[PDB]
């Protein structure tokens, strides 16, 4: 009766196995540059985990830490230098950027073929137009996770709660490519629980700890919890654990989506490399 | 009781009045180039209407007709010539292109600042990322039409049926910017009538004459009919006229969306001009 726990580590390992296999069939090794401004503790931990996993795979991985007060003109110069550096395959800027820096301007400076996070408007535009490109890592990880665990998304009623550029909107675009029926909900949706109750697959990316209660969830739903809420030294999802009483399967926090986000960044780094070479 | 008829001509006229006003406050006049390959009768009629209206506004408007068997290399050369022609503000390629021509390749050749149809992946990517750009004309026309007639889209349940790059997907993106809750449905949605029955605003762009029946429609819904189905020398929408019995307001065919599509192309032509100059 109780919900299965959709572990991200098991699904991420299948991605990592695919990556290791493809590397042997390659002359070179992919090279990832991660840029961080300042010392935000959540930012420090995230990049340390991206770097650690890239290196564990055998990538050339390098974190470039700058002071918080780096001028945006210096950031753009560095990115241009890395765009031209033919030995760098992937360029990643850790968000959030400090307020004196125009984030859109920085992201649009990254060359689209090195844009492993998929935020460049050319990659966004390729995603929604049906073409090839580098797409955002959490949405890729959510789609891959669902397909790993045997969900046939064709014809499924999917509700996505949250409409950010990092998760909800590229997620909605990727789910349409799997022929799902997609509802994008957000903070101005009225009677949100009634909207979510329709979902056979419910994906929540809002950043409110345990916001989603069991009355919001359809019996037998597949629930994917993207939230990562630091609360009392713990990590809390956006979905209340009581949802395991109603859902057929539920993503744990931590260890659900999070591992898949890292895995697909490693996969986007390979892809960016092969798209150039 | 019966549905109001949301005329596109009345809403289009408010756009045209805005355009005429802004032109007097301008030194120059916008210049539109429309390219057509072959002699498809629906294509001929569409471009003739875009040209006629651009000229009626006072634009420099020119249709370049080429043979159907024009090589795609010549098309791309012509577009590059027009991209560099500093006297051309808007470049438009009439679809469908003949099969020997890669449509994505042609559309991506148009400079984004002259891409009055909004298909270039940079304009698609700006739309979904929340930035500024030139967006597709029918979706713009649907949003503007609804706002013209007093629909407050914030918090509304909107269902969009059809997920093309020309209508459904840019429409979904534009509706999110108005804070609607958006459902994208399509040919693989199961129990489509039940999905559409939820919509307070229902937009249909599928190209099946009178497909949508009154049982599919929520009482008091606002129904926007994008279909244009040539049948028995008439023009039939995708929505059955019986829907006027249940809907609060319904877009006629012809004269509903169609006029708004033309108006927003004229508006995108102005915008492209001012974005350069
Ligand atoms: N595990 C991972 O790899 C990973 C990656 C990225 C983010 N995250 C987590 O996901 C969370 C969201 O961050 P984000 O950047 O994706 O999104 P975001 O832009 O920060 O906001 C999330 C969206 O959720 C909606 N929302 C917020 N509160 C709501 C409420 N009470 N009811 C209904 N809707 C509500 C908002 O809609 P409106 O726009 O309409 O206001 C907002 O756009 C964060 O806590 C972050 O830690 C995890
Ligand atoms: N008035 C205007 O300015 C204007 C402009 C453009 C188009 N149109 C009209 O709009 C119509 C659609 O053309 P388009 O290019 O926008 O779209 P399209 O790419 O040709 O197809 C429309 C979409 O509707 C869906 N669909 C088709 N039949 C369906 C059915 N029986 N049940 C549920 N969904 C169905 C399909 O979903 P799937 O992808 O899942 O198969 C398809 O993607 C055309 O007839 C065209 O004349 C009018």
Numbering used by the authors:
A (entry chain A), B (entry chain A): 1 to 277
What does the publication say?
The final model included one chain of TtMTHFD, one NADP+ nucleotide molecule and 60 water molecules in the asymmetric unit. TtMTHFD consists of two α/β-fold sub-domains connected by two large α-helices, which are at the same time the N-terminal and C-terminal α-helices. The N-terminal α/β-fold sub-domain is the catalytic domain that binds the main substrate, and the C-terminal α/β-fold sub-domain is the nucleotide (co-substrate) binding domain, which are variants of the structurally conserved Rossmann dinucleotide-binding domain fold. Both domains are interconnected by an extended loop-helix-loop motif that we here termed ‘Connector Helix (CH) region’. Compared to the Thermoplasma acidophilum MTHFD (TaMTHFD) and Acinetobacter baumannii MTHFD (AbMTHFD) structures, T. thermophilus MTHFD (TtMTHFD) showed an overall RMSD of 0.98 Å (with an overall sequence identity of 36%) and an overall RMSD of 1.29 Å (with an overall sequence identity of 39%), respectively. Conversely, using a cut-off value of 4 Å, a higher amount of salt-bridges in the crystal structure of TtMTHFD (n = 26), when compared with TaMTHFD (n = 16) and AbMTHFD (n = 10), could be identified. Interestingly, again TtMTHFD showed a higher number of inter-chain salt bridges (n = 6) in comparison with TaMTHFD (n = 2) and AbMTHFD (none), indicating the importance of salt bridges for the thermo-stabilization of dimers. Furthermore, TtMTHFD had a higher number of arginine-formed salt-bridges (n = 23) compared with TaMTHFD (n = 5) and AbMTHFD (n = 6), as expected for thermophilic proteins. Thus, an important conclusion is that in TtMTHFD a large amount of salt bridges probably contributes both statically, i.e. through more elevated Coulomb interactions, as well as dynamically, through higher energy dissipation capabilities, to the stabilization of the protein.
